[PDB]
Symmetry: C5
Subunit: 206 residues, 5 copies
């Protein structure tokens, strides 16, 4: 359990081999979740990349936040993908919150504290608890099979995960910096393992 407060992981160059594995003490399969994080990259103009890769022995894209070139954010649960278009991307750190509820199939996507419209994905599905959670690479197999053309080059930090859906007020206080306690992944008590060319530096965002 490391307190990563005020720090970020840095992936300085394109690679096939650099990544961070986040460990979740998870037991129950997930019937809802929220994932929040900050990242900062210049890749958006030139190619696609993985922001947050959550794989199961059965499904490599159990939860996947991804940027696909010339389109926008792609959100995947249990292999099914929906898009959140983004025209006119700007060069700055980005904060995202994303949530999904099995009961309703409703997914929420928040960019820099502002909600995108609500969409539907995998109603009644159940997300596996035996997971390989990876920053910096996109998983095609449980814990590996990375593609370099999908790696994240830049910084990522403030990664947090809950096993339920955050309310708009909660998401807001998270973005504005208020106090909170995630029950799946906690940036302030993070169990992680590093592989390859990854560094821990002070965060570039406020």
């Amino acid at each position: 359990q490391t307190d990563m407060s005020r720090k970020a992981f840095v992936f300085p160059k394109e690679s096939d081999t650099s990544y961070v594995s986040l460990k979740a003490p998870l037991t129950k399969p997930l019937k809802a979740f929220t994932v929040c994080l900050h990242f900062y990259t210049e890749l958006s103009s030139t190619r696609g990349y993985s922001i947050f890769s959550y794989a199961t022995k059965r499904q490599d894209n159990e939860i996947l936040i991804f940027w696909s070139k010339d389109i926008g954010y792609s959100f995947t649960v249990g292999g099914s993908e929906i898009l959140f278009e983004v025209p006119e991307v700007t060069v700055a750190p980005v904060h995202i919150c994303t949530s999904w509820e099995s009961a309703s199939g409703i997914v929420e996507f928040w960019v820099d504290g502002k909600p995108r419209v609500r969409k539907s994905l995998k109603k009644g599905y159940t997300v596996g608890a035996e997971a390989s959670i990876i920053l910096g690479q996109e998983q095609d197999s449980f814990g590996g099979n990375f593609e370099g053309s999908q790696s994240l080059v830049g910084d990522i930090g403030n990664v947090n995960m809950w096993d339920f859906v955050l309310s708009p007020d909660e998401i807001n206080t998270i973005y504005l910096g208020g106090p909170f306690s995630p029950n799946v992944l906690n940036w302030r008590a993070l169990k992680y393992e590093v592989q390859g060319e990854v560094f821990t530096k002070p965060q570039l965002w406020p």
Copy 2:
């Protein structure tokens, strides 16, 4: 009578079958009215949709607030339509107030607290009180005959209706959040019936 305060209806995917019916205890035929609501959708770029459908046994478009593609807001009273052009639409929740007065034929259309110019529609007409009021679908018959290419995908909430014309000061306090009491539909004492894939969630707008 449910208190819908701080909540919204969510229509997560395009459908033919999902809608909400709002019940008005109305008696007198309407010689004036105001309708206010918040909605949030990404459909504006790709197709048209119904925001608020108010039908009579005699007229399916007795009161109709509609977004027509590549044009802007369409407002219909007793079957007659006028347009309120909107170039450069932005992706965010929108709040609208719209009013009509039989005596003068004057209609007002307010977007996010700002008035559009005043226009003329159906001077001397009378709006029926035996109505089917529907969110999420556009009515082609009293209480049905929906077209999926006109459904609302996204959120809608804070729906309120008065049987008179709101003054600019009143509309302003409504937009800014001050206190008010509608006498036809009241979001804080709403009698409604749900059909299909419709959910009640915390509102995405302030």
Copy 3:
């Protein structure tokens, strides 16, 4: 004498017949004047229109504030016209103050409290006091001969006129809402006559 405070005239649809006649207790011919008013229309994109028409038995355009399509504001004294170009018009209520001095020929044109450059018009001329002052239509004869292609569709209010030139400080307090007393036309003590489809409603601007 009606107190029109906080109210505006509304001309809801294009017409040939709808207008307001303002009555001035004027005696001395004018050797200087200032005219201020608010108006709100969507016509700027599609055609020209008259904002303030002041006619004499001898001259239909004794004082004329007009919007000419794809050009901007046209200001006419005693039949002579100058232009105040406006590129990139915005859709909102507009406040204008306009002044002219015989001694110097200097005209001023203020839009939303900001001065346009000073220009020259009719040095030494004298404006008649026996006037037909009309809102909503453009006069081609003393008190009539309207063209519908020049009518104002929308709102106009806060019309005030002085028989001298307002200083920049005075014009500023007028725009910001401070106190003042006009000595030719006074919105707070207005003698007027309505003809046709014209209504009195609460103003849409602050």
Copy 4:
């Protein structure tokens, strides 16, 4: 000595004949100077114009601040010209400060309180003290030979001149309205002579 505080010269229409002559009690030839003024014109879009013309019996363009069409500000000392490009001009009063030092050849050009980059002009030259200083026309001879295609149509005021180079802090306080005392031309104690169609009016700028 007139106190021109809070007033400006107005040149209402294009002319060949209208100008103001500023009188400087100057004795020493100038080895440095600063000139500050406000002006307001709409000519920038259509043609060039003279802002401040300072002529010697030997040199018609001893000091010349000029706007040249589709380029920007032109600054001339002793007949030698440098340019300060201006794309995207806006329609509003402009305040400029311009300075030159013989010792270094450095010229500064300040627009609305903001410094342009430093440039070089006439190192080691000496500016004559027997000068004809003219507002509203561009001099081609000592005290005359005006070209109408170079006249200033609009307002000009707050003209002040020093015989040394103003520091950035000094220029700032001049722009922001603080107290100062110029030692060549003083707007608050201005000795001037008017010719033709020129008027004195309250300034349009703050």
Copy 5:
């Protein structure tokens, strides 16, 4: 040791010959560094230029901050170049901070207090301590071989250098004006030598 506080070097015209040499009392070879400075030029539109040239007997571009035309900032360590694109450059003084760490190869580039994304350059390299540090010209040999098409025309000042990597908080206080003490080059205790047409003037930036 001169205190250059509140002063800048001015290079008024394009030249082959004008420059400043900064002297560093450096002993250890550098395994990390940070360089900060302000500069102000109008060259960005027309050609490239050197901002900060640091040369070794072995490498002319040991550390080079450079603006390359129609691309943006170029940062070079030990001959290897990376780019920091800049579209839509603005005409104003610019402040930059740039850093490099041998251990990780991470470079940071900060413009006007805002971080660009982190990149990789020369991991494990070592920067030489026997250096010729030059402002105003780009070095192609140790202490000379300048190209005029790469000279800086304008102002440069507040040059400071550390032998370690500044944290984001430190960089912020440097940009906002707080206190600091650099241990390689110190603007407040600067040992320098001037050659050619270079002047010392009060800085144009706050």
